[PDB]
C-alpha cells in the first residue's frame, strides 16, 4: 500500500484504488496502473521534474529503503496478476531490487522529489509507475 499527496490530489496504484478514490476520480490510466482522486486536505509532497536515473525506494516487505539505478519511463510487456492480464504497461521504469505484491504504493524518490510508485515486480526486478510527466499535479 501507499499514496502521494500533492495539493488537492491523491495518487495511488489504480488496482489498489478504494470506492472513495473512484467516487472522487480526477484521472485514471489502466495502461499505467495509475489513478488520481481529489482530496479536501492540502497535501505537501514534492513531485520531481527531472531525468534522474538514480534514487531510493521504500520496501515494506523489508521495512527498509534501498538505493537503486532505474531505466527511463517506457513501454514494457509485464506478466498477468488477478488485477490485469499480461499486457504492455506504459511509463514504467525497472530496477534491480526486491519486491512483493504488497510493496505496490511505496515511493521512489531522487534529490528533486517523488519520481513514482511501485507497481510491478518479479525475477529480482522492481517496476515503478512514473509520475514526473504529470505536470498538472502542481496546479
Ligand atoms: C511489486 N509487485 N507487484 C506485483 C503484483 O502482482 N501486483 C501489481 C499488479 C500489476 C500487475 S502488472 C502491473 N500491476 C508483484 C508480483 C510479484 C513480485 C512483485 C510484485
Ligand atoms: Zn531527480
Curated annotation (Swiss-Prot):
It catalyses: Selective cleavage of Tyr-|-Gly bond in the picornavirus polyprotein. Coiled coil: none annotated. The active site is at residues 15, 33, 104. Zn(2+) 1 binds at residues 50, 52, 110, 112. Homodimer. Cysteine protease that cleaves viral polyprotein and specific host proteins. It is responsible for the autocatalytic cleavage between the P1 and P2 regions, which is the first cleavage occurring in the polyprotein. Also cleaves the host translation initiation factor EIF4G1, in order to shut down the capped cellular mRNA translation. Inhibits the host nucleus-cytoplasm protein and RNA trafficking by cleaving host members of the nuclear pores. Counteracts stress granule formation probably by antagonizing its assembly or promoting its dissassembly. This is Protease 2A. It comes from Coxsackievirus A16 (strain G-10). The lineage of its organism: Viruses, Riboviria, Orthornavirae, Pisuviricota, Pisoniviricetes. The chain holds residues 869 to 1007 of 2193 of the full protein.
